[PDB]
Design a binder for this molecule. Structure first.
Ligand SMILES: [Cu+]
Length: 79
């Protein structure tokens, strides 16, 4: 019904985080950063893609939440 009635998705390329602590620290950070209806990070697939509310948030906080955690982030969705 509402997989994303009023939200958007963003995929961030990541690197240098091939250790559990990067998926539980980026999933816990992005997942609870603001409104992440679904967050998918993968220390081995080297990417972090999630969904967020573009009405109150945007891919700048997802880039600030990945930049805040400490992992090379190269989002390839809007740009
Ligand atoms: Cu780690």
């Amino acid at each position: 019904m509402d997989p994303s009635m009023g939200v958007n998705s963003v995929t961030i390329s990541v690197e240098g985080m091939t250790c559990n602590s990067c998926v539980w620290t980026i999933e816990q950070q992005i997942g609870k950063v603001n409104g992440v209806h679904h967050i998918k990070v993968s220390l081995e697939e080297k990417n972090a893609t999630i969904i967020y509310d573009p009405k109150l948030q945007t891919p700048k906080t997802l880039q600030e939440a990945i930049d805040d955690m400490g992992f090379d982030a190269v989002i390839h969705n809007p740009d």
